[model samples]
Target chain A: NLKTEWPELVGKSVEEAKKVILQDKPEAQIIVLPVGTIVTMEYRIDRVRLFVDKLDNIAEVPRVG
Target chain B: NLKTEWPELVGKSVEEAKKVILQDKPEAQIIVLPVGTIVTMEYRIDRVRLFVDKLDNIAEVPRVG
Candidate 1:
């Protein structure tokens, strides 16, 4: 699974996360948003949604499929 | 935040997952799909996406936003 493939991205920087994720899945839909921002409810279909905290640390690495 | 809130759902059954998720987030957009099924890349919003394998075990519990 992609989560196991990239299991070390939970605490990684957004830039590094993007670099590694894009490197693996060039067509991955990368969505960057603030920590507490409320987004839509349709991105659970094989995509990467990175939630960046106030300090720019990836607080959550939610991958939908 | 939601990840921490629902950390015990990774290996739960689809029925239990639905119960807990809906109970917590009454408006959660829960999507059920086959394990190897390729879904769209739009479910990256505030919702719960459960990936159920042939055995009915929830392989992945992905949340957006």
Candidate 2:
């Protein structure tokens, strides 16, 4: 259901994605990560996790707790 | 940091959070879990993980690889 709201940002630059995301959710917790950056699966309160590839394109937009 | 972007959605309803998230990142992968729901720490491509407390508010926004 969440996927149906914002448009796909996979190929967009990180800056562009951030602009759109912030414009919409101003308070969104944005996490920018390289394609293969390893990280813990701990969910924080009130956050949006954005994973970016080495090319600076949005890789994955994961749900954060 | 991701935390500085979207506004906090901690006490909001799951439906509201999803709406805001999707409105910004239509491609976001969203996973909703009830309070105390144990889960694997595996990170999936193209997904967002949301953990909710028994009160239906977000509990944490963690990092995923």
Candidate 3:
């Protein structure tokens, strides 16, 4: 099935990855991360790994130019 | 509360309305229903009642058309 957004994860099965990025730190921008990529962290360095049991309550509405 | 689609009913509270729409009937083309309106029905009608506990898995990215 095609998932246009994360919210579709709700009530669905999902697997998580092990890796993390700090959103507020300057390195966050330098981090090579792609949208929809899942990552896990050993500690709460800056970001926490989110499980995809279901997508978050937010939608990723794309911004078109 | 804003609902753009029927799938959003997952994990949310919603009331249903009853109505029949015979899609195969020629009159079906004249059916007039407004978006975001909730409805329910008895028996295996052309349409079934749905509750809106949470938004559906689908997102409502506005269509430019």
Q: What's model 3's interface RMSD, roughly to a tenth of an angstrom?
A: 15.4
Q: lDDT per residue, candidate 2, B1-65, as tens digits?
A: 23222336655667887787776667777778654456777866556667664335554542232
* Candidate 1 residue spans exceeding 4 A from truth: A1-5, A44-46, B1-65
Off by over 4 Å in 2: A1-7, B1-65
**Per-residue C-alpha lDDT of model 3 across residues B1-65, encoded as one tens digit per residue:** 32222322222222211111122222322222222444354333233333211222111111101
Worst 10 residues of 2 chain A by lDDT: A1-10
Tens digit of per-residue lDDT, candidate 1, span A1-65: 45424545654678988898888777777878655566667645547887664335555554543
Candidate 1 docking quality: incorrect, acceptable, medium or high? incorrect
* TM-scores for the candidates: 0.42, 0.41, 0.17
Query: In model 3, how large is the Cα lDDT of residue B2?
Result: 25
Q: Which ten residues in a row have the lowest lDDT in candidate 3 chain B?
A: B56-65
Give the DockQ (C-alpha) for candidate 2: 0.04
Better-scoring candidate (DockQ), 1 or 2: 2
Q: What tier of docking accuracy does candidate 2 attain?
A: incorrect
Ranking by TM-score: 1, 2, 3
Residue pairs clashing in model 1 are: A40-B45, A42-B42, A42-B43, A43-B42, A43-B43, A43-B44, A44-B43
